[PDB]
Amino acid sequence: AVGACVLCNSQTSLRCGACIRRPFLCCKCCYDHVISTSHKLVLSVNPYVCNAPGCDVTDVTQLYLGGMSYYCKSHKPPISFPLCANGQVFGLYKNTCVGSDNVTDFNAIATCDWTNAGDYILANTCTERLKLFAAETLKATEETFKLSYGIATVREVLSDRELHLSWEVGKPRPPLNRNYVFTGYRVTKNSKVQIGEYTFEKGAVVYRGTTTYKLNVGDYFVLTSHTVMPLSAPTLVPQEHYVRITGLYPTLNISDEFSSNVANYQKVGMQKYSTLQGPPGTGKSHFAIGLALYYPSARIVYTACSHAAVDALCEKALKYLPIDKCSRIIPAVECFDKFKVNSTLEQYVFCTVNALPETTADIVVFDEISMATNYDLSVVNARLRAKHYVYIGDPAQLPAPRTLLTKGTLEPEYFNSVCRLMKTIGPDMFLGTCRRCPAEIVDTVSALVYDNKLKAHKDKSAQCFKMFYKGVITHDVSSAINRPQIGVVREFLTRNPAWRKAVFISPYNSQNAVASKILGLPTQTVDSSQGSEYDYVIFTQTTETAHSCNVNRFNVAITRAKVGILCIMSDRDLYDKLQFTSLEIP
Amino acid sequence: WDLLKYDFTEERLKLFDRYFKYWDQTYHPNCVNCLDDRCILHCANFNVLFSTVFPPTSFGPLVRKIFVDGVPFVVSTGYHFRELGVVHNQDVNLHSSRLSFKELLVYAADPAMHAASGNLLLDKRTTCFSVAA
Amino acid sequence: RDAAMQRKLEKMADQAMTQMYKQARSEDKRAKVTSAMQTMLFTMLRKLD
Ligand SMILES: [Zn+2]
Ligand SMILES: [Zn+2]
Ligand SMILES: [Zn+2]
Numbered sequence: 002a003v004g005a006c007v008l009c010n011s012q013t014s015l016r017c018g019a020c021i022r023r024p025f026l027c028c029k030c031c032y033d034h035v036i037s038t039s040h041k042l043v044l045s046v047n048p049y050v051c052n053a054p055g056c057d058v059t060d061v062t063q064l065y066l067g068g069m070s071y072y073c074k075s076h077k078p079p080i081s082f083p084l085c086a087n088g089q090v091f092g093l094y095k096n097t098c099v100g101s102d103n104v105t106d107f108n109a110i111a112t113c114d115w116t117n118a119g120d121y122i123l124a125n126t127c128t129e130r131l132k133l134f135a136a137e138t139l140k141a142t143e144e145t146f147k148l149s150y151g152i153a154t155v156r157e158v159l160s161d162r163e164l165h166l167s168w169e170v171g172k173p174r175p176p177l178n179r180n181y182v183f184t185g186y187r188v189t190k191n192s193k194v195q196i197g198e199y200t201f202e203k204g205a206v207v208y209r210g211t212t213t214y215k216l217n218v219g220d221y222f223v224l225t226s227h228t229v230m231p232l233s234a235p236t237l238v239p240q241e242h243y244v245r246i247t248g249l250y251p252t253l254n255i256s257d258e259f260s261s262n263v264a265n266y267q268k269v270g271m272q273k274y275s276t277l278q279g280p281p282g283t284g285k286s287h288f289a290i291g292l293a294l295y296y297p298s299a300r301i302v303y304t305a306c307s308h309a310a311v312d313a314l315c316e317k318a319l320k321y322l323p324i325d326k327c328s329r330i331i332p333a334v335e336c337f338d339k340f341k342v343n344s345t346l347e348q349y350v351f352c353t354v355n356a357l358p359e360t361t362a363d364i365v366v367f368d369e370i371s372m373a374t375n376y377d378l379s380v381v382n383a384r385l386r387a388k389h390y391v392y393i394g395d396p397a398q399l400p401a402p403r404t405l406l407t408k409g410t411l412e413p414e415y416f417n418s419v420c421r422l423m424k425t426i427g428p429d430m431f432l433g434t435c436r437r438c439p440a441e442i443v444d445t446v447s448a449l450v451y452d453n454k455l456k457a458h459k460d461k462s463a464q465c466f467k468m469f470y471k472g473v474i475t476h477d478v479s480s481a482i483n484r485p486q487i488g489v490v491r492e493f494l495t496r497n498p499a500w501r502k503a504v505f506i507s508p509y510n511s512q513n514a515v516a517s518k519i520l521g522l523p524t525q526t527v528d529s530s531q532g533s534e535y536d537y538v539i540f541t542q543t544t545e546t547a548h549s550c551n552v553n554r555f556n557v558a559i560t561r562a563k564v565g566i567l568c569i570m571s572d573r574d575l576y577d578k579l580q581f582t583s584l585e586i587p
Numbered sequence: 588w589d590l591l592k593y594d595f596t597e598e599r600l601k602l603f604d605r606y607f608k609y610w611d612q613t614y615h616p617n618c619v620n621c622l623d624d625r626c627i628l629h630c631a632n633f634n635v636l637f638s639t640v641f642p643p644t645s646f647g648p649l650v651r652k653i654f655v656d657g658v659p660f661v662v663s664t665g666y667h668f669r670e671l672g673v674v675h676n677q678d679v680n681l682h683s684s685r686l687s688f689k690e691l692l693v694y695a696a697d698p699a700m701h702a703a704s705g706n707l708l709l710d711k712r713t714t715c716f717s718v719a720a
Numbered sequence: 721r722d723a724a725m726q727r728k729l730e731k732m733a734d735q736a737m738t739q740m741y742k743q744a745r746s747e748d749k750r751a752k753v754t755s756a757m758q759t760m761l762f763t764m765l766r767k768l769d
Binding site: 002003014045046047066068069080082091092093095 | 725728729732733735736737739740741743744747748
Binding site: 661691692700703704 | 754757760761764765768
């Protein structure tokens with residue numbers, strides 16, 4: 002009804018009815034949003050619509066104030082008053098308003114339904130309130146676009162990891178990634194009951210769930226979304242250089258367990274909010290864990306953008322942090338239940354943004370910052386309030402699911418508010434001791450993107466081979482089939498069966514789908530796999546398009562392996578750049 | 588009598604057949620089934636006599652457990668009048684997503700939640716049937 | 721006329737703004753009363769054993 006403006010933060014009672022989020026607009030702001038857009042519906046304590054019976058006009062500049070209600074020209078009384086006057090729509094606080102000359106950003110956010118990268122660019126290069134409004138508009142249009150997908154009406158239940166599933170005709174196929182988890186709710190005899198949340202992924206759909214369930218007749222799974230509440234808290238408060246190490250309690254005993262992280266902790270203790278630019282596996286999973294032990298005097302709160310990515314966090318947290326004094330609140334999908342519920346007052350808290358109550362802390366760490374959006378940052382800052390925020394990662398990771406983005410992919414420095422200051426003014430802190438990846442990968446990434454800030458771990462065995470295949474591009478639904486790659490797989494596996502002890506990594510599971518006819522292994526997606534990796538890796542890119550497999554996709558996807566990784570450089574990008582072995586067919 | 592029992596519709600008919608066997612007018616133990624206001628008055632007159640037999644704990648709001656946001660509620664989905672007999676609500680939602688204002692007002696005005704959330708009251712100062720504190 | 725129709729329009733606008741303020745305050749009171757009643761119901765249901 003009444004609230005602060007988006008452009009001025011001034012109290013107003015005008016909301017754009019044609020805006021999907023309906024933000025509060027000042028009188029001058031409402032006038033600006035009305036004249037320069039087709040948004041002719043403006044909302045108040047009463048809708049600005051012609052209340053005369055038998056009329057259907059829903060304009061604002063054509064609407065006139067008649068009596069106690071609103072009318073158009075065709076129905077206005079002789080005593081009439083134009084709603085659009087003095088460059089401001091008639092509303093509450095018509096004399097206490099300042100306006101703003103920056104109106105094109107709001108119109109671009111509202112008019113454009115998030116079709117290209119420039120919308121996100123202008124959303125990130127603005128103030129906090131406009132950015133939050135853009136984030137919630139993006140979430141609303143994301144929900145609208147997600148609700149326009151197919152509905153899985155299960156006609157038969159065949160077995161596990163495979164279903165006899167069919168759908169309607171015309172409705173499109175859900176995407177490959179896990180960003181489209183189904184959380185539908187079916188009815189059996191009288192009303193709705195519990196179903197559960199699962200992330201169905203394409204391997205007749207394979208489910209990446211650790212539990213079992215038997216479906217029934219008439220049960221359907223829908224892309225259930227939520228209602229985006231208004232976002233109040235900003236992403237981050239402005240930084241300020243402290244004179245001393247305050248806000249965290251200095252203890253006389255220091256930890257010598259991580260000698261190369263004491264300086265990093267000292268530098269974090271001087272900055273309000275900080276983020277360290279490191280490749281995946283550069284102490285990313287345990288930096289905050291070692292921080293919680295270096296200074297066991299700060300309320301450390303762990304949070305992630307995915308509920309299935311918390312297993313990597315909990316894998317070593319129980320070995321490093323105590324298990325008895327740590328607990329997880331169970332809401333009334335597979336996590337530990339041996340912890341103690343309703344532990345409001347605890348030094349270490351593990352929870353998710355979906356059901357995070359109001360609390361306070363001193364140090365908050367947000368791992369996997371790439372897949373979190375400005376709306377996610379606002380939610381994190383509103384659920385948990387602290388004077389310090391720590392971000393682990395870098396913009397050069399897997400980007401957020403920009404599903405509505407049709408044109409070129411967004412630049413890394415425009416993903417979030419953190420990515421803005423992470424790449425424009427310069428990384429606040431950097432890691433120079435990366436003893437996790439060998440000379441090959443570390444040298445490649447240092448020469449490629451990481452400002453030659455990474456040094457060789459050990460010698461390069463140079464055991465990786467790349468064959469020169471060409472292949473043909475042919476799309477059927479969303480993938481491609483390459484018989485020559487089937488040939489090279491055998492020509493590589495012929496030497497020894499011991500090569501197979503590896504984790505199959507592929508953004509698109511078409512290879513697994515083809516192989517399932519003879520092998521049938523369950524399918525898992527690499528979206529949430531950081532912190533756990535094997536020595537050998539099986540890599541099949543199978544793609545060359547910049548729409549998804551762009552330049553900032555492989556430089557961090559090759560860093561997972563320790564010493565053994567498939568380095569098939571079928572793309573004509575880095576073939577004549579490194580010195581590996583290659584041979585022709587004898 | 589059973590404490591949970593509130594209907595007594597069969598008992599009222601048995602009383603009517605025992606004491607007014609040849610009363611040549613149809614008697615409705617529940618006044619929901621009456622024809623007009625005159626029949627409502629006629630059957631309520633018999634219900635007045637017949638309610639002096641049944642326990643006073645079986646009259647008042649008829650409550651049942653309903654769920655809102657999956658959380659159980661105790662609301663009156665009916666009433667057992669000493670004169671009007673057993674009356675059941677027609678728009679009763681055993682489950683609901685949320686209540687905006689009207690159902691919230693009804694359940695707030697409903698003595699069901701307050702009586703269920705109050706301490707048992709035995710007020711010996713008055714002979715009136717105490718409910719809860 | 722400029723001091724009779726325009727002055728009347730100004731009075732009508734002031735009256736409409738006053739009615740809008742009263743309606744906004746009524747909606748705020750409705751929200752507060754709704755929250756209070758909902759919290760009362762939810763805090764008395766928890767004592768039901
Ligand atoms: Zn709008
Ligand atoms: Zn404004
Ligand atoms: Zn009209």
